[PDB]
Amino acid sequence: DQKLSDFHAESGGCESCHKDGTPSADGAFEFAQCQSCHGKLSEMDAVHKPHDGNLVCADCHAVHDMNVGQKPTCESCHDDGRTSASVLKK
Numbered sequence: 001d002q003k004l005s006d007f008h009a010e011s012g013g014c015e016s017c018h019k020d021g022t023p024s025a026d027g028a029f030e031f032a033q034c035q036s037c038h039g040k041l042s043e044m045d046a047v048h049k050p051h052d053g054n055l056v057c058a059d060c061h062a063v064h065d066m067n068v069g070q071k072p073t074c075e076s077c078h079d080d081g082r083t084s085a086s087v088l089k090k
């Protein structure tokens, strides 16, 4: 296993996401960095799209905590048992 943060740091350092390699308080800088490479939520799949304007990437992708390949789940914010699968293949 590799954390997602470590995977990215191999290709650009901690500074790929963080000013001077140091986290911001707000997370806005980091969100802007994610979007600079990956684009906007509105241009992503059905899991991503309805979160445009209400979440930042880090609200689901806890890049230091989560392995490469590990999918965020949904129960922290929704109470119906939805999954990425139940929405992608709605």
Ligand code: HEC
Residues within 6 Å of the ligand: 004, 005, 006, 008, 009, 013, 014, 015, 016, 017, 018, 021, 022, 023, 024, 025, 026, 027, 028, 030, 031, 058, 063, 064
């Ligand atoms: C983007 C893919 C990242 C890479 C590369 C690294 N980090 Fe990160 N880290 C990222 C986010 C989105 C966040 C949360 C939001 C924010 O404001 O940063 C974090 C958080 C941290 C923190 C914790 C901050 C806090 O608790 O106050 C630290 C200390 C941190 N990140 C350090 C760090 C280092 C040393 C990295 C290189 C090895 C590194 N991060 C890479 C996203 C990303």
Ligand code: HEC
Residues within 6 Å of the ligand: 004, 008, 012, 016, 017, 030, 031, 033, 034, 035, 036, 037, 038, 057, 058, 061, 063, 069
């Ligand atoms: C450009 C310098 C990037 C920044 C900044 C961030 N990401 Fe990234 N990410 C980038 C590449 C080139 C790749 C590899 C291709 C791939 O899609 O694997 C990635 C990968 C991810 C992944 C994994 C996707 C997968 O293969 O299943 C995720 C989930 C991801 N990146 C998320 C993400 C977030 C939340 C960021 C900000 C905290 C972020 N990336 C920054 C390039 C770049």
Ligand code: HEC
Residues within 6 Å of the ligand: 034, 035, 038, 039, 040, 041, 045, 047, 048, 051, 055, 056, 057, 058, 059, 060, 061, 071, 072, 073, 084, 088
């Ligand atoms: C929770 C509502 C999420 C937010 C906000 C973001 N992502 Fe996400 N991402 C999430 C899941 C559950 C998954 C796996 C299922 C899927 O829809 O593919 C992903 C996956 C990605 C990937 C890989 C996509 C692929 O085609 O394999 C990437 C690169 C990714 N996510 C990046 C990403 C970025 C950069 C975000 C902010 C703009 C972002 N995600 C938000 C869940 C959630």
Ligand code: HEC
Residues within 6 Å of the ligand: 046, 047, 050, 051, 054, 055, 059, 060, 072, 073, 074, 075, 076, 077, 078, 082, 083, 084, 087
């Ligand atoms: C909190 C940090 C969230 C997580 C984790 C996930 N979602 Fe979410 N979602 C969130 C907000 C703030 C909103 C805006 C509307 C609302 O519920 O208040 C959404 C919206 C959706 C939607 C649109 C339909 C609806 O329920 O309103 C979908 C289809 C959706 N979210 C799916 C989804 C999935 C599949 C998640 C797990 C991968 C997920 N969300 C996580 C906040 C948050």
